[PDB]
Amino acid sequence: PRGSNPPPPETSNPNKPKRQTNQLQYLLRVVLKTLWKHQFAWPFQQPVDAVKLNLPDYYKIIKTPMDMGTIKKRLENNYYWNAQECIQDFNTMFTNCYIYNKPGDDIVLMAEALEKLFLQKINELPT
Ligand SMILES: CCN1C(=O)c2cccc3c(S(=O)(=O)Nc4ccc(F)cc4)ccc1c23
Numbered sequence: 268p269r270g271s272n273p274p275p276p277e278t279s280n281p282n283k284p285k286r287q288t289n290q291l292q293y294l295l296r297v298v299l300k301t302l303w304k305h306q307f308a309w310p311f312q313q314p315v316d317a318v319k320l321n322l323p324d325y326y327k328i329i330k331t332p333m334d335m336g337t338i339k340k341r342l343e344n345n346y347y348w349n350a351q352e353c354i355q356d357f358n359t360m361f362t363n364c365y366i367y368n369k370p371g372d373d374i375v376l377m378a379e380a381l382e383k384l385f386l387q388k389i390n391e392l393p394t
Pocket residue numbers: 310311315320322363364367368372373374375377
């Protein structure tokens with residue numbers, strides 16, 4: 268079907284306030300990098316292509332989409348003011364998965380595994 272995909276979430280906004288913190292550096296260098304390499308990362312590495320993946324209802328249900336490709340670019344582009352803004356985006360990505368899909372679905376098992384690893388890495392966030 269199509270129809271169409273929305274514009275992806277922004278990864279640049281020159282008027283948005285931003286900072287480099289060592290916590291944001293750790294989010295890129297440790298948290299994002301480890302999740303990124305994982306065997307379950309691939310469905311979360313770019314925005315949902317609702318056309319290709321045959322998920323025509325995706326953007327009827329999910330109105331705040333987020334993915335690790337967007338987060339990666341936001342970190343590389345120094346988009347954030349603090350770590351919480353970034354952790355927010357990971358939480359949105361996970362939440363969207365759990366909202367759209369059913370417990371026990373293969374995609375949800377992936378999200379749960381990534382989220383478990385995420386929380387472990389988040390646990391060692393530096394001062
Ligand atoms: C994480 C974004 N996302 C979904 O919420 C979702 C639902 C259904 C399929 C699918 C896909 S898929 O069409 O590539 N199929 C897929 C099914 C189960 C998996 F464990 C991984 C991918 C990619 C990313 C997705 C989804």
